[PDB]
């Protein structure tokens, strides 16, 4: 298997404008949404057909109840945070928990918090400690590090529980997640500003979104200014990207263990 990751985000919004939920929680396996919940629907729902088909109603009923309690917990932590900062109005609170299964079989786990879209607290599961960005974050950390059983629970969840969930979801969503759509790559040449030639290397129709694109000069790295286009979703499960240079030249593309060269 390629590298895969499972992530769960939480977004808490104080004093929300009409049409904005107070709480959102979405789960992801790689780029794919898998679960959703908001303070408006108050229901845990699948966001992938392979999640709906393989997880029995009891799973949705159970997570609906946990998310209702997590919603309450988040509303209260955000109030305590605002009080610590002497802040009023609309502020945001976010959490990201997750894990990665790498190709070589090793694993990673991360758990972090953000206040107003900025880094606030970062868990270090190897020293069982929290890294605080300021005095307010430091006050919270001091309380969270007093509960040694919670720290141990978090480590166990990140290392064992998250990996086991991810391995389950990778099997459920096998036909989506473990598939390969090779890229369609073309090099376009054009005389731009008088005496300047622009080389564009464009790729599309590829899955997974992880691609390596680089321009080379006579076999070795081009110590010039390369422009890179974002890996953008095409809307059909596949992606697109590009790389450009100015003026022997060859575009190099790596996708799912296949290397491609496009000589000019």
């Amino acid at each position: 298997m390629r590298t895969h990751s499972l992530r769960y985000f939480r977004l808490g919004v104080s004093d929300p404008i009409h049409g904005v939920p107070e709480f959102i929680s979405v789960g992801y396996v790689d780029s794919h949404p898998i679960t959703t919940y908001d303070s408006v629907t108050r229901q845990a729902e699948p966001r992938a057909p392979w999640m709906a088909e393989n997880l029995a109603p009891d799973h949705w009923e159970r997570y609906t109840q946990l998310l209702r309690g997590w919603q309450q917990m988040f509303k209260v932590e955000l109030k305590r945070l605002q009080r610590h900062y002497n802040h009023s109005g609309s502020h945001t609170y976010q959490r990201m928990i997750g894990c990665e299964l790498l190709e070589d079989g090793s694993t990673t786990g991360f758990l972090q918090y953000a206040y107003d879209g900025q880094d606030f607290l970062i868990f270090n599961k190897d020293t069982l400690s929290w890294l605080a960005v300021d005095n307010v974050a430091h006050t919270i950390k001091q309380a969270w590090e007093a509960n040694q059983h919670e720290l141990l629970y978090q480590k166990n969840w990140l290392e064992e529980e998250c990996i086991a969930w991810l391995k389950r979801f990778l099997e459920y969503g096998k036909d989506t997640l473990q598939r390969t759509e090779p890229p369609l790559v073309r090099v376009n040449r054009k005389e731009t500003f008088p005496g300047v030639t622009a080389l564009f290397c464009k790729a599309h129709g590829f899955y997974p979104p992880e691609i390596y694109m680089t321009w080379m000069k006579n076999g070795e790295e081009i110590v010039q200014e390369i422009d890179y286009g974002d890996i953008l979703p095409s809307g059909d499960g596949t992606y697109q990207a590009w790389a450009s240079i100015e003026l022997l030249y060859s575009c190099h593309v790596e996708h799912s263990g296949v290397h491609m060269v496009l000589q000019v």
Partner: antibody, heavy 109, light 114 residues
Framework: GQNIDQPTEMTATEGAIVQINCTYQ??????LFWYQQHAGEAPTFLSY??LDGLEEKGRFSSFLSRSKGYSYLLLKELQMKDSASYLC??????????WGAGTKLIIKP | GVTQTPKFQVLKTGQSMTLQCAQDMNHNSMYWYRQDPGMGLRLIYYSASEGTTDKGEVPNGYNVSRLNKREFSLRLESAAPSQTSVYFCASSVWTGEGSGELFFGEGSRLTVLE
């Protein structure tokens, strides 16, 4: 989670040692708990274990082997007051508690 | 810090009953268990936080009300002899948390007779 097993009854002598075992077969693991329940009273928390090792709270010790799917509650220097039931509970993947039928411990003076 | 009432109660089949439970510990999660000889505690209903409740392992014959953060009452609509048991109420700070222990009430000994 599906099943938790612990012996129905255990008898040991006062001043000695007793080990109450708990085996679990669950779908996910987020921790094992031990409760002490005196006859006619409410259960009271004794210990929590989620990672491998042995934790000691006086004469009481709790051990967890996440690989063997087992735990034990160890009682040292047995006193007559330790005559009680010992309940074993495991939190599954979905954070739901799975309870064992309990172990009644009888101390011989 | 959990207070449950009544400690004892005799009921006639078809009679209604409400069991009371309060905690002054600022806990969000509340549970109603029944203890029957030869088996582990069986969850009737639980309340993960204020504003929500759900069925447990054995909800038939019961209903619950999470009145506020402090109180969670258990109701027996039409008492039945199989409902003769020892009932326990419990609270924990949160659910969806691994380490957080249960705090039990003193228990309610209920007898149902024809």
């Amino acid at each position: 989670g599906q099943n938790i097993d612990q012996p129905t009854e255990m008898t040991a002598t006062e001043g000695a040692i007793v080990q109450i075992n708990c085996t679990y077969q669950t779908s996910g693991f987020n921790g094992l708990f031990w409760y002490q329940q005196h006859a006619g009273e409410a259960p009271t928390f004794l210990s929590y274990n989620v990672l491998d090792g042995l934790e000691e709270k006086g004469r009481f010790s709790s051990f967890l082997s996440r690989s063997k799917g087992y735990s034990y509650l160890l009682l040292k220097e047995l006193q007559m007051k330790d005559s009680a039931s010992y309940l074993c509970a495991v939190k599954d993947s979905n954070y739901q508690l799975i309870w064992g039928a309990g172990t009644k411990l009888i101390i011989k003076p | 810090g959990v207070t449950q009432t009544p400690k004892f109660q005799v009921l006639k089949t078809g009679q209604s009953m409400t069991l009371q439970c309060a905690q002054d510990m600022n806990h969000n999660s509340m549970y109603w268990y029944r203890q029957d000889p030869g088996m582990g505690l069986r969850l009737i209903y639980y309340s993960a936080s204020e504003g929500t409740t759900d069925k447990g392992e054995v909800p038939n014959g019961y209903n619950v009300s999470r009145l506020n953060k402090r109180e969670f009452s258990l109701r027996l609509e039409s008492a039945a002899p199989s409902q003769t048991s020892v009932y326990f109420c419990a609270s924990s700070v949160w659910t969806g948390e691994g380490s957080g222990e249960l705090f039990f009430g003193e228990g309610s000994r209920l007898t149902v007779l024809e």
